[PDB]
Please model this.
Amino acid sequence: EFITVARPYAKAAFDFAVEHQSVERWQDMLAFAAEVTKNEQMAELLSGALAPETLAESFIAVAGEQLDENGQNLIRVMAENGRLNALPDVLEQFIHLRAVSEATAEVDVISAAALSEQQLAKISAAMEKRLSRKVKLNAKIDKSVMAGVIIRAGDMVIDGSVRGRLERLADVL
Amino acid sequence: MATGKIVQVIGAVVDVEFPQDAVPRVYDALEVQNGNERLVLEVQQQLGGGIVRTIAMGSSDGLRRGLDVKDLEHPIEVPVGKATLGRIMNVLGEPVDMKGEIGEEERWAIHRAAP
Amino acid sequence: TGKIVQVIGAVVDVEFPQDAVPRVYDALEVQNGNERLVLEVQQQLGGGIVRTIAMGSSDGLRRGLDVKDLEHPIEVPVGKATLGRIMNVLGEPVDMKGEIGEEERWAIHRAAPSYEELSNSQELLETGIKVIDLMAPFAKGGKVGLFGGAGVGKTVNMMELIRNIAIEHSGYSVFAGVGERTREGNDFYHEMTDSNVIDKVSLVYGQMNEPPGNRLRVALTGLTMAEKFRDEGRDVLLFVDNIYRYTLAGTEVSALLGRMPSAVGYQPTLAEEMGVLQERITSTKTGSITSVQAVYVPADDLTDPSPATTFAHLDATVVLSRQIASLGIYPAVDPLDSTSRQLDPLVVGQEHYDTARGVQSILQRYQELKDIIAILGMDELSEEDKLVVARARKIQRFLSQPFFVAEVFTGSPGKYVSLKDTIRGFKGIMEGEYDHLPEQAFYMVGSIEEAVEKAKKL
Amino acid sequence: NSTEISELIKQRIAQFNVVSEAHNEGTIVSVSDGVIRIHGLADAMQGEMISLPGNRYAIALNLERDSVGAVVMGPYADLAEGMKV
Ligand SMILES: Nc1ncnc2c1ncn2[C@@H]1O[C@H](COP(=O)(O)OP(=O)(O)OP(=O)(O)O)[C@@H](O)[C@H]1O
Ligand SMILES: [Mg+2]
Model:
């Protein structure tokens, strides 16, 4: 998967955007660059073994919403190594690094039923001290858990669901 | 007019990149200026993207990346006929003795099909 | 739902929606021209890609073909409905007769019986073959392995074992042809039908002409039928025409599955692939399976990993040597490499054990002397060494035996030899009672009395 | 704002005339020792006869994700990258 190869490009792009205080525009440009990659004819074009410079100049043609001095440089650098398919992953790693830099964390909450605002507030307050970062909760209550709640942040998971208790109890067999 | 440029030099193996519409065929002969002498390269493999991979017919030392490459469109051609008798030649058909130029009448490609 | 994305020889990759990825060993179905092609899932790659092996000819497959997901593994008919019929690897009938009256179908991939269920047995099973039951006797419900190169006579020995053993065994039998000659399968089927014993035998045939998937999975179908017969509580006989082809098919498909080569280029999972198949062929407290397996030896190298791994799974091993076969001695059993778990004084008794060990020692001494004989000739030997050589040659001749199935080759009629007669004859030969007879007297004689009768006319 | 940029992408690719190859047609990507790598041929099948320029054929052995591996049923030295098949 392009996860490992996307990292240097995402890091470089994020550092550059930080030095120029233009992170949001970069994120939008990265999203646009990731969308054109998914185009069906562009996918065949990218799969073909064109020369790096001709493929790059053809890619720049389909993008008029890019900051040319920096976005074109990015695309040409990725083109010279054939990494253009990694753009959807470069975007995700750029978002992740931005969230780390802003000390902000997304948290998913799953329960049998919709929670009250006070419970959400206590959850957010506990998680902010657990992570020492700002948090943004989202609620994705589920049909299968019949009681309790699940809290997932990053990959650390706290389970209080009754389903989890039922399975953990049967394990003592 | 030279159309290709050298991109890799690893021992005797030399890689040359050509425009996509002018990639030389296999077994064709290229030549480059290796300082003060012409060095002939034989095409072995056509790689993707216009890059060709060649075996140098001579000393590879002193080759820089980016040197211009002239694409001779015929395979290695050597003089033939009565003029060759009594003469010493290398693989390229150049005289190795000091007895001057060969009075060639024809030059034939070395790669040809069997009867 | 699925889409084909790669076709590399026998291996086909299929992409599925990430919520519906088929499990390992699930059977898939795809229309290939004017016929239906079954694919078996081997590996789950990332992103909903799954890697499969085609149970048929993969030519004519395009990219982007729609693939249908069956929710169950390959399941084959089992039970008495399979008796007397020829069946494909997929459990389809191959004879021109109608559909199989199946009542139940079983998945071919099954777990081995647990350690508790295993049963021990020591009932010696008699054969008509002097060398086999003398040097390497085997018990009912055990494993027998015939090792040999190309052309040494594994199949002839297996047919003779079938003929002899079927006499005192009234239960069902299963014959699984794996990657062998189709001609031999047709001949066997016709000779079974002519003898009206076909109705007791289930035949699963995937021969060498088949693509690798059929040869790879065919043995498991035969094993599943044998296990069905066993769990019913019967005593079954299983014959595998060539176990080596299964590992060979694994080797052929291994590279395309993206696995690095090992050893001599075999698949890294060679030992596990062999063990998972071999462990299911076992007698159990509910029922017993007697198994005879021919094991091809590539390039006559008994040290190749494929023969080497098989040696540990078998109870009795009979090794056939090309050098002996070139002498015209048949069966070309090598008595200094053949061995059985049953050659134990407790089970076989003292007399059989002593005769076998005496024969083994005499032949070992002859092998030791042969290097001197080659250079200096026999004249240099001591007078006891010459007697050892003379007795060893007589023993080597006496091990030969005319087979009933070989009458089409030798012409001479076959012989059946009891264990009592062979042990008495070999003990008499070693004691020197017959030292006045010529070597040729013992060649291709059933019993020692026939040997002395042949001596009168030389 | 995603559907509009996607249709803008379609409009732009239409403007600059980048278009996929036709089915049953492809282009030679590389040539070495008689083995041919071909891009396209979305409707090729395993074991098919692929007609080359001139009057010779290649046999499709591998249907990779992005290319077809083929062997030339004759002299291969005259073939060149970018030839239509
Ligand atoms: N008892 C016998 N008498 C005479 N010839 C015999 C005897 N047993 C085997 N042979 C010889 O063995 C030869 C080959 O036998 P068979 O077909 O069983 O070999 P195989 O080991 O199964 O070989 P393959 O590896 O080709 O399948 C026959 O041609 C036959 O002449
Ligand atoms: Mg055989």
Q: What stands out?
A: Residues 343-458 of chain C form one domain.
